[PDB]
Amino acid sequence: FSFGDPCGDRFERDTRVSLFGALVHSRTYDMDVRLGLPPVPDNADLSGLAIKVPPSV
Amino acid sequence: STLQQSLELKRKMLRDKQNKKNSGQHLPITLPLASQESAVVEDLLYVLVGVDGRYVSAQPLAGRQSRTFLVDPNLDLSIRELVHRILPVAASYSAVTRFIEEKSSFEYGQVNHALAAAMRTLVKEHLILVSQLEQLHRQGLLSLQKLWFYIQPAMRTMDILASLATSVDKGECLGGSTLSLLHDRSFSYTGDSQ
Amino acid sequence: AGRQSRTFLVDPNLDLSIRELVHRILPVAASYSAVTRFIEEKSSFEYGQVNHALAAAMRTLVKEHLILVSQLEQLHRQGLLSLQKLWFYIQPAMRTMDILASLATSVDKGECLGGSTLSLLHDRSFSYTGDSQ
Amino acid sequence: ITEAALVRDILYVFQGIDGKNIKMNNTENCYKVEGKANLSRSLRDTAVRLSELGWLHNKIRRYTDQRSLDRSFGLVGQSFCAALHQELREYYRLLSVLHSQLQLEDDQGVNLGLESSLTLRRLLVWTYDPKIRLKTLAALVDHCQGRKGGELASAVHAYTKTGDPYMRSLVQHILSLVSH
Incomplete structure (x- = not known):
């Protein structure tokens, strides 16, 4: 009667924390999280905007 | 659009790889300067998503070229030149995103699909940056000089990505040729270390 | 009217999107009302031990549904319940209740009793x- | 047109409901923004992007309704329909989460020019990957349309080769569930 918690399958887990892949840079188990994006880096006006490379880990 | 070429590449890669892949896995199937600046911010935030702005409208893409934009002639010459210098980044982003979204299909094979997926991920990071800059503008923290400075690295990244996309498309590189x-x-x- | 699912009258001045969401949810409440009516009637000793036990199990599941609904009511009283969160949380419950109601209606149409009920x-x-669940 | 009204319409379209200012255009099989002059062309394109998601939702729901009633789909067909419904449930959970985040942004009331504020552009970015996922699922449904039983199993095995690692994992999980 619930959407079962995606604790089991890693694919299901990532889907849940990504909201079926909706979340880009965040993962959450909390349904009441206010979605925010990472703040604009202070050097963006100084160094420009770099393409964020996902960490290899 | 790069999306159509990438989808055609997907179909071609699917056929060629199926012949190459003995593994039986089938592929999945008058304005004030501040007001001019504000209007240009809205147009640029649309162009970064590939939407024509009110004062800046995109011209139709001729071939596998970066998207061209029509700018209102009544804009400041310095503003117009800065806009034309930044617009290349948004055009490259739009072309890269179209190619990434099409060639990430299973038909393009895991190599081309992964390449397109990586391009899409980097476009996502770029879009996150652009959204933060848009927020700063809504916060009033985005100046035209700050905007130009912030887009300069994004412009270089997008230009590199567009050059790579055009080279892959001209070479029709697939599989081992794509790896080469x-x-x-x-x-x-x-x-370019990055 | 008859052995039909319960119908609801909604105020016509509701938002069309809201009205459609309400009409989408109302099927769950209609199924619940029908299931409760069936459970309460077939819970009579006259219904035999098998049908009585079936009704008792249905009553336990209805109690669980009511508990869930009470927690959701609390969240609404807490102001923590949105329409989309409610829809999401009830969707699996809606499907479970709909399956149970379809089974109940099929049993009722067949008047299945004892070994025929077991079959x-x-x-x-x-x-x-x-449906593993 | 207020941005909040567009947000409401887009959230409804994600649920397949016509908004106050965005209505389904059956000719485009997408939600169309009402022709009131004050909609930005960028806003129109964003509405079209959200209506692609609403179109996918409506297609999925049409498929689910068409196959839930078909007893002739057999145990394999029922399992496939169940898998599709489960993926739809996950999608609806995601849409509900997005709606709750939008509600949080509405509740906070501040046009905070912070990088965290839910903007229509930020919403489009956050739904881009979900949009790709939904597009992949819709293309798979189209390719799998009319197939059942061993034909569905063959389509699923073909679907495991998707290049998108997130799509690849999803299709592998769906294949495992249908093969169970």
């Missing part, structure tokens, strides 16, 4:  | 071969 092209591009970026 | 239960269990 990737190696050659990695050698071509010897001076 | 019908087996067949329904096979009917849920694709």
Whole structure:
């Protein structure tokens, strides 16, 4: 009667924390999280905007 | 659009790889300067998503070229030149995103699909940056000089991505030829650590 | 009217999107009301031990549904319940209740009793071969 | 047209409901923004992007309704329909989460020019990957349209080769569930 918690399958887990892949840079188990994006880096006006490379880990 | 070429590449890669892949896995199937600046911010935030702005409208893409934009002639010449310098980043982003979204299909094979997926991920990071800059503008923290400075690295990244996309498309690189092209591009970026 | 699902009258001045969401949810409440009516009637001793036990199990599941609904009511009283969160949380519950109601209605149409009821239960269990829950 | 009204319409379209200012255009099989002059062309394109998601939702729901009633789909067909419904449930959970985040942004009331504020552009970015996922699922449904039983199993095995690692994992999980 619930959407079962995606604790089991890693694919299901990532889907849940990504909201079926909706979340880009965040993962959450909390349904009441206010979605925010990472703040604009202070050097963006100084160094420009770099393409964020996902960490290899 | 790069999306149509990438989808055609997907279909071609699917056929060629199926002949190559003995593994039986089928592929999945008058304005004030501040007001001019504000209007241009809205148009640029639309163009970064590939939407024509009110004062800046995109011209139709001729071939596998970066998207061209029509700017209102009544804009400041310095503002118009800065806009034309930044618009290349948004055009490259739009072309790269179209190619990434089409060639990430299973028909393009795991190599081309992964390449397109990586391009899409980097476009996502770029979009996150652009959204933060848009927020700063809504916060009033985005100046035209700050905007130009912030887009300069994004412009260079987008230009590199567009050059790579155009080279792959001209070479029709697929599989081992695509891997060779990737190696050659990695050698071509010897001076660009990023 | 008859052995039909419960119908609801909604105020016509509601938002069309809101009205459609309400009409989408109302099927769950209609199924609940029908299931409760069936459970309460077939819970009589006259219904035999098998049907009585079936009704008791249905009553336990209805109690669980009511508990869930009470927690959601609390969240609304807490102001923590949105329409989309409610829809999401009830969607699996809606499907479960709809399956249960369809089984109840099939049993009622067949008047299945005892061994015939057990056969019908087996067949329904096979009917849920694709639904692990 | 207020941005909040567009947000409401887009959230409804994600649920397949016509908004106050965005209505389904059956000719485009997408939600169309009402022709009131004050909609930005960028806003129109964003509405079209959200209506692609609403179109996918409506297609999925049409498929689910068409196959839930078809007893002739057999145990394999029922399992496939169940898998599709489960993926739809996950999608609806995601849409509900997005709606709750939008509600949080509405509740906070501040046009905070912070990088965290839910903007229509930020919403489009956050739904881009979900949009790709939904597009992949819709293309798979189209390719799998009319197939059942061993034909569905063959389509699923073909679907495991998707290049998108997130799509690849999803299709592998769906294949495992249908093969169970």
